[PDB]
Amino acid sequence: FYTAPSTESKFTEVLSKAKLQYPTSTTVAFADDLLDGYAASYFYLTSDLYMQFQVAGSSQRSELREMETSGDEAAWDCTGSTAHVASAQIAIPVQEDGIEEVTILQVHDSDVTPVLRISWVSSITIDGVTSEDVVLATIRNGIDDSTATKTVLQAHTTSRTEFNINVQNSKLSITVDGTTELDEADISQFDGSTCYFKAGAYNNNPTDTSANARIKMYELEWVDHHH
Ligand SMILES: O=C(O)[C@H]1O[C@@H](O[C@H]2[C@H](O)[C@H](O)[C@H](O[C@H]3[C@H](O)[C@H](O)[C@H](O)O[C@@H]3C(=O)O)O[C@@H]2C(=O)O)[C@@H](O)[C@@H](O)[C@@H]1O
Ligand SMILES: O=C(O)C1=C[C@H](O)[C@H](O)[C@H](O[C@H]2[C@H](O)[C@H](O)[C@H](O[C@H]3[C@H](O)[C@H](O)[C@H](O)O[C@@H]3C(=O)O)O[C@@H]2C(=O)O)O1
C-alpha cells in the first residue's frame, strides 16, 4: 500500500541515475525498477510529496547510490577538475528514541571508504567540544587513516533544508540553505580514487536496534560530468 516516488516527475532524474540499496549494500531496485513504480515500507512517497527513507538496525541503510544516465555506475575521479554536484532538499524529522546518528548524504569511493558523510547526530564531541542535535560533515583523512575531520554545519531543524555538495579540483564544499558551511576542504587524499554520491537514511550507532531512522527528501539531483 505504498505510493512510488516515481509518480512524482521531480524524481525522474535521480531515479534514472540511481539504484536503491536496503538494508545493507545489496541492491533492491535499479533505475528502471525505481522508474517503474518501486515502493516499499523503507522507500515511498509521502502524501505531501517527499521521498521518504526508513530503516532500523545498526549500520543499516535505505539509500540511493549514484548511477549514470547511460546505466553505468558512477565512478568519477574523486579529485577531478569537472564539477560533481549533489543537491537535495531534506527534511530531517525528530528521530525516534534510540536513533543517535543518521547519515543523509555521502561521497563514497569505489571501495570501502566514505569521503564525506553528512549526518544528523544527537551528540558529537569534536576536539573536546560537545555539540547537541546538529548536522555534521565527516571527511575521512585517508583510505589508510580511520580518523576524520568533522565540522558542524547546522543546528538541527525539522524544516526542509537545502544541501549542496560540490566536489571539484580536489576540494569539496557544502552549502546549507544557500550558506557555505564547509568551504573547499581538501580531499586530495582521494587522488587516484573514483567516487559516487549516495543519499537516503544510513543509521549509525543506534542504541535501540528496532527503532527506525527516517529521512525525507523533497528534491534530489546529482550530476557527474564525464571528462
Ligand atoms: O569525533 C571524532 O572525530 C571521533 O571519530 C572516530 O572515528 C570515527 C570516524 O571519524 C568516522 O565517524 C567513522 O564513521 C564510519 C561510519 O560510522 C560507519 O560505521 C562506517 O564505518 O564508515 C565510516 C568510516 O569508516 O569512516 O566512525 C569512526 C568511529 O570510531 O566511530 C575516532 O577517530 C575518534 O578518535 C574521534 O573522537
Ligand atoms: O556508506 C558508508 O559510508 C559505509 C561505510 C562503511 O565503512 C563501508 O564503506 C560501507 O560502504 C559501502 C558503500 O556504501 C556501498 O554500499 C558499497 O556498495 C557496493 C557493494 O560492492 C555492493 O556489493 C554492490 O554490489 O556494489 C555496490 C556499489 O559500489 O554501488 O558497499 C560498501 C560496503 O558495504 O563495504 O558503508
Automatic annotation (TrEMBL):
Pfam families: Alginate_lyase2. GO terms for molecular function: lyase activity. This is Alginate lyase (PL7). It comes from the Eukaryota. Disulfide bonds join 78-195. The keyword Signal applies. InterPro entries: Alginate_lyase_2, ConA-like_dom_sf. Residues 15-220 form the Alginate lyase domain. Keywords: Lyase, Signal. It comes from Paradendryphiella salina. Alpha-D-mannuronate binds at residues 117, 140, 202.
